[model samples]
Target: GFPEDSEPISISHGNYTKQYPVFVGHKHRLDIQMIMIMNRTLYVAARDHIYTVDIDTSHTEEIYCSKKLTWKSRQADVDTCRMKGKHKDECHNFIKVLLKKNDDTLFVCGTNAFNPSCRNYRVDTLETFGDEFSGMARCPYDAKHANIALFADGKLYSATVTDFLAIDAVIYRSLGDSPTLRTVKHDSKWLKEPYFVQAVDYGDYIYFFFREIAVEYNTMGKVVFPRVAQVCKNDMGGSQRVLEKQWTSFLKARLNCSVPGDSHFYFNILQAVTDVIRINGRDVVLATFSTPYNSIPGSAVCAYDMLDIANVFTGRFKEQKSPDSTWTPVPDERVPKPRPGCCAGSSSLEKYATSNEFPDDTLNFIKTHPLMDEAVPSIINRPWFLRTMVRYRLTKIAVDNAAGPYQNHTVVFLGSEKGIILKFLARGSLFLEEMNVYNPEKCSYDGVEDKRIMGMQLDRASGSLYVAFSTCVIKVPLGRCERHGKCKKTCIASRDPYCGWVRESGSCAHLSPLSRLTFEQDIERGNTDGLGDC
Candidate 1:
């Protein structure tokens, strides 16, 4: 049934209705995905093919066909969503897409052509460019695919499995290296075989995110889980150090999948962004995972609010309300509310805006005392407030593990396996007990054609979100959504170095430093920004 006309937004706004065709001979289902945006157009990669769709949002066009060029190759029948490590592919399919900085060339890396390699499409010349453009350098062996990134500079960062016999490797390419690109193995065991790789170049550094096996001790003796790992591409900020002589510095953390088998803990893909995000003058690291996953509780969207816990000093205090429903603004028979944790006194509320300290002693003090059945309610004593806010069922099909767009404002564009990308806009405080959702049909499949949507890329410079997967590329206009992200301004209240303000352009800014090491000293200089007031 259609929605009421009086409703502010329309039904089928984010709900797509369409169908698209795929090559009949390709063994794998046409799962059009892996998207990159350039020149207001979207470049999509999937099913051993690449297509460029116009940015109009109403129309689409296929620009290139990997099938016609047998040199591009295809994959053998293997379930990518369930399979671990590399499977089978003839040409370099599953090629992740990235737009060149100058917007002149479209770069792609995947595992079809001779295993896996990197290639670029020149927008100006209207021709494909690369030494291996015609399939020259094949993957040293099978099971290796190309995972690549381009920094603000011309250099390129690549993570790949060397051969069927080698582990996953990290390497780089300087702009001028033609058909012959250098491949340097960063470390031997940081990542064995990354099923899905997300890499980015920013602040003169290269960053990568992937799943690595984690070993731990349990009741039996030892247990292992998938560990999320990351490593910077530079030691001293130089790409030339490619393979010179420095060991790679990496960070590893086990994925926090609860086992009530509480929720589906399957890790498919990773996405990251570097921005000037700071709370109370301190830097914050915001990361989002697309876990269109299911569990006992129900279908849920998992959000990991990863902050510098030690630096922030705030713990998950008891909630003041039930996370299952919205509480009333005032006290009444109809409005039920929970009391503050025994620790949150009046003072904590006064300094809530500026005070970075959490009263751990207060929480501990509450543990010592107890009230026998009160009329109102007691707070839920938990380390952190973990709640499942929204629920929806899948109607179509598409692939999983392709990266999704996570921006400043909390608007998440989820691409479906069946070629439909749903735009979900967050409506309230993320930490609040319950949140609302708004769907905006900024872009969707037209006239009942289904085009597989694989991966997505958002162009902050152009304000467009690009959805790429198997055979089709979808471009979403920024103008369609009223709530777009804006850059944060510099902060002004940081005076104590430990207070967490950064000095930029002779003024104090609230964003975390490009490198915490360099900015840790800057904090001592009394650089404070007042931007945290917001």
Candidate 2:
């Protein structure tokens, strides 16, 4: 039977629906960059303002201070840029960075009318905002540009640029009691108009993901390559000499996502990356990529194992013996110890607190060899799936683990340039479901379709996904397993870890006390097809 209400769509395999507040602020372009839910309040950072809305009541309040503009500020330039060109009106005082500091406070940053600025807010009280701090590299001046700010253990790990022209990019770490450590400025080797994606902390190292022009690739024009870079948390920089206040442990390796056998067609340009995860003791990374428009006109998704990533970092180094010499690999015997980019052990850090304390030979060797010779290959050597028919560009991806029928299975949710959402299980036989933000015929077109997904956050507590649109926030429920599995065949075939087929009931059901025993028994029996007849 088809879905009775227009709220949900019944595709070939599954049902999809969207739930959104009727009183959402639709008149204003939402351009929401971040969404945080706390104590039943949904906080949204859109444009130059911060808003707090009740999840149940839809009562919204403007929570933060307004933007401050100046003549020389980027806001002025943004206004000028809006008048004539391809993306004129896209420039605005967008709030691109927001992080919850503690239970009581929130840290916020805006393209501050183009002169980037930061503020600390007392969200619990909603009374005062702390004195403004220079946001420089902490926030991006243009919302269209890429910058990732991650708050971990009281510190902000940021990968962004510093100037209005957006050329001086840096990997910056600040907060806590320690001094700030940033990358070398104006160095193309460190970064080149790079688009920062995500910053993740694992064990003792902080990892950064992004894509930049592969300057080493001697092509007629610039070729882009995705990268995974890491920096040691304890690195205190070089001792006032070489790379003083800069990261000595900084190192990057190329990430390769390509086709399987003989052809080996590579999707070298990465668009976005997911946070790192540990799966069965191995690190896993998920990234989205696309080929040049002139080539294959489609987007693809690939996964990478961290062991392969570690191999590249610990492998031989790439070097240019002379300015005119092509880059080549140097054997491991030629590399220096404690190993140039190895995470500093307690013993090593105790002996040398700063890069300046290290031997000049080791420091010089690292300065010239920050890149790995070998590229980290994608796990499956092919995209799990690709979007070839849809004209819309895929923007962001989120993963929900143990979200399918099998144990520890994962499902991926993809957001698109148009207001559409796609959900499917990677490396599985489950079919994909397409969801629209609003029913076109019934719902008024208040620019919702024009909006692109700026951020996607999953609320595991409620099995809800909060999508940040250009001007509004929408929440979609990830339907529970029982609702999806109407029959035994569909239930088991769905491959959804959340659902199980109950032989006694002759139907699909969620694993509760009544069904748990039978569900496990069926799995123990290794049942895939119809066994004893109903």
Candidate 3:
């Protein structure tokens, strides 16, 4: 079924067919960088200006504020940018980092005419406050890179490229009360050409999700492997004598998202991933993985339980026996006391409380053995949903945990490069449907085919997913149970966890405690015997 009727609007009308709250603003080229949905406003980060819109209103132009967060490339910087043989258009400031910092400040960074810089703005007024500072390590000079710059405890932890060439990439930390720390520069074993996806500031550790060249693979092809790296939030750098200003708790493990058969097909490229979300009775990281062009044209969604991922980091460390030797797991008996990757407070020995105070042997061993031997395998040891021979490539995804009758149903809104959104029910392992969002007559972008979805965010309170583009922001209903109408067979047969056939009211919609209706759902087993009775 095709949803040609789907059109973005300022607010929903009485007509429920396809009136989604699609926000169109005049100030910025919605070349959306980051979208932060707070309280009742959708903070839209874009080129030159940052706009805000009421998340639930049809105020339209009224919701589009005139006094938005606006910054421009100074004439001096723009002139210098062109002098360097770069395009004049690329010299414009493009907002890149948009994260809430502390209580009252919104930390935002942008490609300031090819020079990255950051500033703090008042959360209420969206007015600049703090002094501008270099955003070199926290934001990308290109601004369009799939990088991450997140704030946790007033500290900026980011994975991005620095320098003019955009080649010296590193996982860096800045701000906060503690000393600055980062992965060792130019260390391929630590990080090389890594494209970051999701950076999660978990309880004690910050996990970096990215894909990089697999130097340990020992192949001429220069293979790429998706990796999950961990760094303790309170890392105090290495000893002054050995490795100073470097992360002592830096360790990464390969994330195994593959098709197992006689010849395993690995989806080595991690396009996008969601933070920790409860699905299927456990906390899982939902990610979209794809194969390179040389391999089968395939994209799939794979999930890894957090506990399983944690165990991989705690398992045997991968070691290259010698400089020329292939990688192998280090024996457990030989591992030094006070585990290398474990945080300071987690250990029994108080003498080695801080990484800087760890015996030189422990520090050196960890430095050499940063790669984990056991890769984090996907949930159920395989992809939860797969796609091939498809016209679009997945670019981003937003997970909405379902509630009520289907609390276990985790809906994944997958946005593709072609501006199509796929609604997937993770519990049922089904793709309910995909909607082609951009119609050519809608205007402002290159073409319907060229429309790229920059960001997709779920407003759980409103049950709408906001899909961002260069021209406008479109709102999509998270639950489209109306598509099934009165047919109970078609409802449960759809295998949609967001919807079920309600017997009391005789309709397909989300569960409600008021009705206490008997809902028939065949998510696990699609038994559609009531098709004729409708």
Best-fitting candidate, measured by lDDT?
3
Q: Which ten residues in a row have the lowest lDDT in candidate 1?
A: 370-379
lDDT tens digits, residue span 93-146, model 1: 544444564557656555543345557666544356657542222222332243
Which pairs clash in the backbone of model 3?
Answer: 9-22
Tell me each candidate's TM-score.
0.47, 0.82, 0.90
Clash number for every model?
46, 10, 1
Model 1, TM vs. native: 0.47
What is the lDDT of every predicted structure here?
Answer: 0.34, 0.67, 0.77
Q: For model 1, how many clashes? A: 46
Better model by TM-score: candidate 1 vs candidate 3 = 3
- Candidate with top TM-score is 3
